[PDB]
Amino acid sequence: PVVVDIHTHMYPPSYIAMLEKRQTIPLLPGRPLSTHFASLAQKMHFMDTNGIRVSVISLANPWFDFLAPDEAPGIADAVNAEFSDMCAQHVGRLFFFAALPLSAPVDAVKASIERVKNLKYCRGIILGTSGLGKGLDDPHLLPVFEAVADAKLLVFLHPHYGLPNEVYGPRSEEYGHVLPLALGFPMETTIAVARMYMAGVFDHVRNLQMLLAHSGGTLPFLAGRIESCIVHDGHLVKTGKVPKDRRTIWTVLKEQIYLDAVIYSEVGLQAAIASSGADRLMFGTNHPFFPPIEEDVQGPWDSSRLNAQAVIKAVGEGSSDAAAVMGLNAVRVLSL
Amino acid sequence: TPVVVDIHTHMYPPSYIAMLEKRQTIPLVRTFPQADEPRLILLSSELAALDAALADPAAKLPGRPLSTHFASLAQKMHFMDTNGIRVSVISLANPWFDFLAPDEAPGIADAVNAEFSDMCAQHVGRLFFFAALPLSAPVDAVKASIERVKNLKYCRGIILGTSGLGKGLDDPHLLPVFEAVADAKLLVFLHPHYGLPNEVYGPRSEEYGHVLPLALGFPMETTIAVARMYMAGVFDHVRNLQMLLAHSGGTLPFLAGRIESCIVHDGHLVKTGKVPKDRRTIWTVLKEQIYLDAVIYSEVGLQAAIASSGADRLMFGTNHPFFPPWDSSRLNAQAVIKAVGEGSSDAAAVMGLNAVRVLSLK
Ligand SMILES: [Zn+2]
Numbered sequence A: 001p002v003v004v005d006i007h008t009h010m011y012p013p014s015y016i017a018m019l020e021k022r023q024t025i026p027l028l029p030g031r032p033l034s035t036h037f038a039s040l041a042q043k044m045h046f047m048d049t050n051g052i053r054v055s056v057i058s059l060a061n062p063w064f065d066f067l068a069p070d071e072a073p074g075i076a077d078a079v080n081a082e083f084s085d086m087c088a089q090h091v092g093r094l095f096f097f098a099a100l101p102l103s104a105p106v107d108a109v110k111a112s113i114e115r116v117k118n119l120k121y122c123r124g125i126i127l128g129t130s131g132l133g134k135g136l137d138d139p140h141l142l143p144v145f146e147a148v149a150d151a152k153l154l155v156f157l158h159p160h161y162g163l164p165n166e167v168y169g170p171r172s173e174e175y176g177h178v179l180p181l182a183l184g185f186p187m188e189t190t191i192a193v194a195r196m197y198m199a200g201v202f203d204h205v206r207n208l209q210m211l212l213a214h215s216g217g218t219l220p221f222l223a224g225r226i227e228s229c230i231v232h233d234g235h236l237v238k239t240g241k242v243p244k245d246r247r248t249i250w251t252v253l254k255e256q257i258y259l260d261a262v263i264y265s266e267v268g269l270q271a272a273i274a275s276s277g278a279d280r281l282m283f284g285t286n287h288p289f290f291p292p293i294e295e296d297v298q299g300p301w302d303s304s305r306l307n308a309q310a311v312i313k314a315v316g317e318g319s320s321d322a323a324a325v326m327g328l329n330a331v332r333v334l335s336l
Numbered sequence B: 001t002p003v004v005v006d007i008h009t010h011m012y013p014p015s016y017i018a019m020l021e022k023r024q025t026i027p028l029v030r031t032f033p034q035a036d037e038p039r040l041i042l043l044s045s046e047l048a049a050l051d052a053a054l055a056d057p058a059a060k061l062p063g064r065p066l067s068t069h070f071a072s073l074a075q076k077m078h079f080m081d082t083n084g085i086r087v088s089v090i091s092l093a094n095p096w097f098d099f100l101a102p103d104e105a106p107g108i109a110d111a112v113n114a115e116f117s118d119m120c121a122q123h124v125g126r127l128f129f130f131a132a133l134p135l136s137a138p139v140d141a142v143k144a145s146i147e148r149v150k151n152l153k154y155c156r157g158i159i160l161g162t163s164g165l166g167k168g169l170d171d172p173h174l175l176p177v178f179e180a181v182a183d184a185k186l187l188v189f190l191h192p193h194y195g196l197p198n199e200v201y202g203p204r205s206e207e208y209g210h211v212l213p214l215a216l217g218f219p220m221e222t223t224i225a226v227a228r229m230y231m232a233g234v235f236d237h238v239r240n241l242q243m244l245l246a247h248s249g250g251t252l253p254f255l256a257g258r259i260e261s262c263i264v265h266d267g268h269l270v271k272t273g274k275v276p277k278d279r280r281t282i283w284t285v286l287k288e289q290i291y292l293d294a295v296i297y298s299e300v301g302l303q304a305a306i307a308s309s310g311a312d313r314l315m316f317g318t319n320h321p322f323f324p325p326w327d328s329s330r331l332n333a334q335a336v337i338k339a340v341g342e343g344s345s346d347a348a349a350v351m352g353l354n355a356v357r358v359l360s361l362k
C-alpha cells in the first residue's frame, strides 16, 4: 500500500538566496515564509507524520518566469541541481519535477530539457500557463512540448498568474486571498488547457502526457459544455475544424491527461474520476501552502486529511482504485 | 404525464431588436450583404471581428445569426409543442437593460416588462416570465420598477447580470434591491454576459470562434459573481433571498470544496473574525438559497450539480433559441436518464415539478 504525493512544493536555499536580491517581486501582506518551505528535514517529517512514503517534489510558483533571459538558464541549472541532490539524501522517497527557464530563448529552454532528462531522480517538468510569454497555444512552444514528450517527461501544469485583478471587484482585499486562490488559480488552469486543446497541441504531439493541478481546475465540470460549444460553432464548422474523426476532450482526458486529487471535495473528486478514470488520478497535498491556524503546525495537517478522506468517500478504503489513486498510479506512470 | 417546465429560455421583443439595429456600439444588430439573416453582436470578444468585417467585406461574419426565433412568440410555442414542453418561463436575454442611459432606463424597462406580461397572457397557463431591472438608473428608480413588476401578471422572478449597479453583486448599495426582490418573493435568475477580460484568451482567440468566451468565460463570470456575493455575506444579510444560477452554477459545484478550504485557512479572515464556528458554509447555502438549472451538456456535470444542491433544487432549461445547428434540449434531457433515472420522481422533479413548486405555476 504505497502512498505517493505528486503535488508538493519546496523553495530550496539557493532559490531563496536570489529572492533576497530583489525588492520588486517576489516578495500582513502575502504569505508568511517558514521552515516548511525550505527545510528538507521538515518535508520528510511531514511525510512520516501524514503517512506519505514517496514524494515527487516540485519548485513552487513563480519559478523562473520573472528572471531576465541572461541569468535564468544559470539559475534554473543550480536549482534543479539542488533538487537532484536533495532527492539523493533520501533515496527511494524523493523524486522531482524540474522547472525550465521559460523567460530565456527557446534554444536555452531546449538545452535545459536535455540536461534535466539526465538528472538523477527527475521524472518530469513543472510549467506555468504563460509559456514563453504568450500562453501555451504559442506555436513557438511546440518544439518544447515535442522535446519534453520525447524525453519521456511528464508535464505538470500548475497555476500562478490567475485572472486579472479587476474581475474580483473593489472589495477583493476584504476576503483575503480566497478569490485568487479558490477561483483564479483553477480558472487560469482551465483556460490554458482549453487553449492547448483548441490549438491541437495534443494531436500534434500525441506522445505528450499532462498532469493537471487541482483536478484540472474546472475542466471535468466544463468538458461537456466545451464539447457542445465546439460542435455547434459556426466558424469552426465553416472552416472545417470539426470533422467526425476529431478527438474529443473526453478522449484526450483519458489518453493524454492525468489529474491530481487536490480538490477538497468528494463531489469534485467524483467528477474527475468520471472524466479521466480511477487509473489516471493521483493523490497530492499542496504542502506546505495550507497549514492549520489554531492547531499545531508540527503535527498532522487538515489540508492533507481532507483530500485523503475524500478518496475513501469516492472509491472506498481497501479497493484497488483507492491504492492506485493514493500512490500506485504515480509509481506506474512516473517509474518509481 | 408530469408537466415539463423550461426555466432557461429567451426572447427579444421586436422593439428591443429595433433598438439594437440602430446601435453603433455593442450591443448591436447589423445586416451584411453576404448573409440573409442579420448579425447579433453582444460581446466584447466580438469587437475585433466586427471592425475587421466593416473594413473588409470578405472577412468572417461577426457575432451570431439573429434568427426570427428571438422575437417570435409563435415560434416559441411551436418549439414547446415539438419538444413536449408544457410551460416556458421566458426571460429577456443578455445584456438586458444594462447599456441604457440612467434617465431613459426605467421607462424602457417598464414598457418591455409590460410587453412580456402581455405575451404570457396570449397563452394562459403556458407562459411565465422573469423581469429585468433598469440597473443603470438610481436605486429608487430600480425599487420603483420592482414594485411595478411585483403587480404584473405571470411574473415569477427577476433576471440579472453580474455587474449590478456598476460595481458587481457584492456592492452594498445593491443590498436593498436583493431585499425588495426577496420580500416580493421573486426568484433571482443570475445569468452571464460580461465574461472575462479578453486578454486571458491570448492572441489566437479569434481562431477558436466563440468556444472560449461561451464555454469558459460565461460560467467563470457566474462563479466569481456568486463567490463575491457569498464572501460579502449577501446570503446572510438577505436570508429570504433565493437564487437560480445559469448553467448549473457555472463551476460552483466543482469549486465549492476548494472555496471552503481556502476560507478556513485564510489567515486574514480568521484573525479579523470573519470565520466563526457557526458560519453558514457554501454547502449549506447551495441547499438552502441556491437553485441550479440543468443546462450543463453532460452526465458528469449534472451529477455534480445534483450532489451539491439536491435533485429537488435542479431545474430543466434549454437556452432556446441560442442553439442553432432541437438537439441540446434532448441532450440535457438525456443526462437526467443516466444521473437519476427515467421514470423516477427525481427526473420528473428536474424536468418541471421543481419549477412548478418553487415558482407557483398556476
Ligand atoms: Zn501548488
Ligand SMILES: [Zn+2]
Binding pocket: B008, B010, B191, B319, B322
Ligand atoms: Zn442563456
